[PDB]
Design a protein around this ligand. Structure first.
Ligand SMILES: CCCN(Cc1ccccc1)Cc1ccc(NC(=O)Cc2ccc(S(=O)(=O)CC)cc2)cc1
Ligand SMILES: C[N+](C)(CCCS(=O)(=O)[O-])Cc1ccccc1
Lengths: 10, 245
């Protein structure tokens, strides 16, 4: 789940 | 133990998060209801290739999903959940929240949905080759339209659609159960103030949202087997991650 993980950062 | 004040603050917080991430203004959607695709324009869509129509619809869904991701990130309690559970909830729930949000863009009077600048019927989507799924989605939007949700009710209901403690794969189910319960109290409290608790018994039954999501995944499989290169070349990576098997 690379993309979802990235979206949840910040 | 969420106090009355804490529940009231949770209501406001959920409504705020939704308002900031609702995608299209309701007033704009409603005023556009008079703008309906012509027979010629419908024909044009029906003559599009399967691949182009899927590609367009995949892009539009991904745009909607990005707003739902942001909604989750701004939903109080959500970012406090463990990372695994955040992902589990969004992977299962993102499409379910879009499907619910979609009823805003659905006109029950003529069974049309807002798509690429105008309102069109389910026959607009014929080139997809998944007309039962489209018909089921229209039916679903129609069932929700009969409840005539306010924006605040959509906010609180979609919060519960997302924060679903029954999702398989949750590692900290208790924390999800607790947030889910507080959201239920917020929902019930708001409905009680507005004399709208009657709608609770009329909400989409168990398994309905799951069925629409499963069919979407299945119909994507069918398309992807027939057009593998297009999905790899052109589909949004988020769409592939959420829905490609
Ligand atoms: C969303 C489910 C229906 N959909 C099925 C499908 C999706 C992807 C591949 C194959 C089938 C078809 C569909 C997709 C998009 C649209 N319309 C729009 O995206 C325009 C729109 C509508 C509503 C809003 S909103 O503000 O109310 C938030 C969702 C925002 C933009 C229609 C059908
Ligand atoms: C995109 N297509 C199908 C070819 C790839 S796939 O079938 O593997 O998905 C070809 C094409 C035909 C006409 C115009 C533009 C592109």
């Amino acid at each position: 789940h690379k993309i979802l993980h990235r979206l949840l950062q910040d | 133990y969420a106090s009355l004040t804490e529940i009231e603050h949770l209501v406001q917080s959920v409504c705020k998060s939704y308002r900031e991430t609702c995608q299209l203004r309701l007033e704009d959607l409603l005023r556009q209801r008079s703008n309906i695709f012509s027979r010629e324009e419908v024909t044009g869509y029906q003559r599009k290739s399967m691949w182009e129509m899927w590609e367009r619809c995949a892009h539009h869904l991904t745009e909607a999903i990005q707003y739902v991701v942001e909604f989750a990130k701004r939903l109080s309690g959500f970012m406090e959940l463990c990372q695994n559970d955040q992902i589990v909830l969004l992977k299962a729930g993102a499409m379910e929240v879009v499907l619910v949000r979609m009823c805003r863009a659905y006109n029950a009077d003529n069974r049309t949905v807002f798509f690429e600048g105008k309102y069109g019927g389910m026959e607009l989507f014929r080139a997809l080759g998944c007309s039962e799924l489209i018909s089921s989605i229209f039916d679903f939007s129609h069932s929700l339209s009969a409840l005539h949700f306010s924006e605040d009710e959509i906010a609180l209901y979609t919060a519960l659609v997302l924060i679903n403690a029954h999702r398989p794969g949750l590692q900290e189910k208790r924390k999800v159960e607790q947030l889910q319960y507080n959201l239920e109290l917020a929902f019930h409290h708001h409905l009680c103030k507005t004399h709208r608790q009657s709608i609770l018994a009329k909400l989409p039954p168990k398994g309905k949202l799951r069925s629409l999501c499963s069919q979407h995944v299945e119909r994507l499989q069918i398309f992807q087997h027939l057009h593998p290169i297009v999905v790899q070349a052109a589909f949004p990576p988020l769409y592939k991650e959420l829905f490609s098997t």
